[PDB]
Amino acid sequence: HMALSLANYLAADSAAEALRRDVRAGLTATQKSLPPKWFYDAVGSDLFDQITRLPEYYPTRTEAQILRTRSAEIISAAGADTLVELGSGTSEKTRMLLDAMRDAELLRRFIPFDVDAGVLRSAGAAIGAEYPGIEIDAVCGDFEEHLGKIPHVGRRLVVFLGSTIGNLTPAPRAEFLSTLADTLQPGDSLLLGTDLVKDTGRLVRAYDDAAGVTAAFNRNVLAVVNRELSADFDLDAFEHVAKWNSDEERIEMWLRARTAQHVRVAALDLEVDFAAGEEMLTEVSCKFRPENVVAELAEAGLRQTHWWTDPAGDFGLSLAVR
Numbered sequence: 001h002m003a004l005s006l007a008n009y010l011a012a013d014s015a016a017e018a019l020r021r022d023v024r025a026g027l028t029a030t031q032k033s034l035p036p037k038w039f040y041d042a043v044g045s046d047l048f049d050q051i052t053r054l055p056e057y058y059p060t061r062t063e064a065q066i067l068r069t070r071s072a073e074i075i076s077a078a079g080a081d082t083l084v085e086l087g088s089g090t091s092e093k094t095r096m097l098l099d100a101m102r103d104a105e106l107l108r109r110f111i112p113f114d115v116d117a118g119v120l121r122s123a124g125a126a127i128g129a130e131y132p133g134i135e136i137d138a139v140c141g142d143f144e145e146h147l148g149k150i151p152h153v154g155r156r157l158v159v160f161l162g163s164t165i166g167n168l169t170p171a172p173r174a175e176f177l178s179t180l181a182d183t184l185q186p187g188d189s190l191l192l193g194t195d196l197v198k199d200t201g202r203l204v205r206a207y208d209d210a211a212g213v214t215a216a217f218n219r220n221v222l223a224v225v226n227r228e229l230s231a232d233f234d235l236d237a238f239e240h241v242a243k244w245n246s247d248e249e250r251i252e253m254w255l256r257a258r259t260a261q262h263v264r265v266a267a268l269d270l271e272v273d274f275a276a277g278e279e280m281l282t283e284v285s286c287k288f289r290p291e292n293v294v295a296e297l298a299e300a301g302l303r304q305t306h307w308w309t310d311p312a313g314d315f316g317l318s319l320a321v322r
Ligand SMILES: O=C(O)[C@H](Cc1c[nH+]c[nH]1)[NH+]1CCOCC1
Pocket: 051, 059, 161, 162, 163, 164, 166, 167, 206, 207, 214, 283, 284, 285
């Protein structure tokens, strides 16, 4: 029910300042862009939840199937009594891992780490009910800033699933893995999900579904800016575009102005213009090669001890240690 510890390192005013800075920088750049972290307000989070069930969006169900068939092996290899989730704690994937830890009579502690305190409370109540006696220590924070705030207690399995790591470009990605590695003690393990290079048609369709749900998700960042910064983006004026970048081997989401648009952002005393056909970058989703996952882990000071992948080779999970 209500048993919980929660530390909260995210302030509303600090988030508001960050949005103002990001939007100013992003909209005044010659090549316009917006950071994807701002996708995930309440509406955008619900849209992403729906995305995970789209026929075209294979990543979630593919990762889940790997966990479904190999969770016992993962938990045995980790030997952890504490599950740290860099993420909500709300998915069936979490429960697959917790179940396996319970089955092995190892489970003692759950540490959900996410940006929404309300979500963490909900996760804590649900998990607390399903695994009686489990200790829950929630951390409300940003995984690019507050990894050092994660408690160093027990033998910890830190999981970073869904190929979230792919939403970081190489420089911030390397910094993230290095920082994360620095927090691991002997006996701790990282479980990392990475979406893999594959048929490019399938990749593009995964980010441009027939039902237009990803398009709604993408355009919602404009609604976020409209509401929070008193802007007047016309969402109907922007086309959703998903591209495969073969040089960087990443999916990119863009918003393309159908016609010329004049946008006023009142909170920033700012006016910007979009030319007809002008495109604005809103997200990258890097796709990996198995050999390069090993390399990127190595550069961060982590040794991959286990590698799991579906029979189609669509998705991969790494276990890595110091
Ligand atoms: O790149 C993706 O596949 C998604 C974001 C996304 C899905 N569809 C469009 N963007 N990310 C992966 C795991 O959760 C965090 C976000």
